[PDB]
Structure formats: C-alpha cells, structure tokens
C-alpha cells in the first residue's frame, strides 16, 4: 500500500465524524497511506484541543 501521506487535523476529524465516531488506525493507515504514528500524533492534537473524547 501507500506510505508517508499527510493529512490535516481537520481532515482526520471530518473523517471520524463521517465514520460514525470510529477509527481503526491499522485500517486507516493502510487505506489512506498515513503513517500510524502520524495518525496518533494528529489524534493527540485533537484530544489536547478538547475536540475529541477518545475511547477503547
């Protein structure tokens, strides 16, 4: 699959909302080509801005 693709926090948040508040980091990294640690990094920034409440 694809590697080192970059997305914005807004794109990830929009994806999450559109995906019913669900994110499979493995699947997402595979399909959209974003590194797993980059997805984690973006989630942390969303969490620290109080924009998302992470579960499971």
């Amino acid at each position: 699959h694809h590697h080192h693709h970059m997305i914005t926090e807004r794109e990830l948040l929009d994806y999450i909302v559109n995906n019913g508040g669900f994110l499979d980091i493995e699947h997402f990294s595979k399909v959209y080509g974003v590194e797993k640690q980059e997805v984690v990094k973006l989630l942390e920034a969303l969490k620290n801005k109080g924009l998302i409440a992470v579960e499971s």
């Binding site: 999450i16 669900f22 994110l23 984690v40 801005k49 499971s56």
Partner: peptide
C-alpha cells in the same frame, strides 16, 4: 470550550 466528539479508536499498536 467545544463539546468533545466521542471517538472509539482501535488497533493503535
């Protein structure tokens, strides 16, 4: 202060 959107996140490791 935004209302936090709930997100279930899996397969993080």
């Amino acid at each position: 202060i935004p209302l936090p959107i709930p997100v279930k996140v899996i397969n993080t490791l």
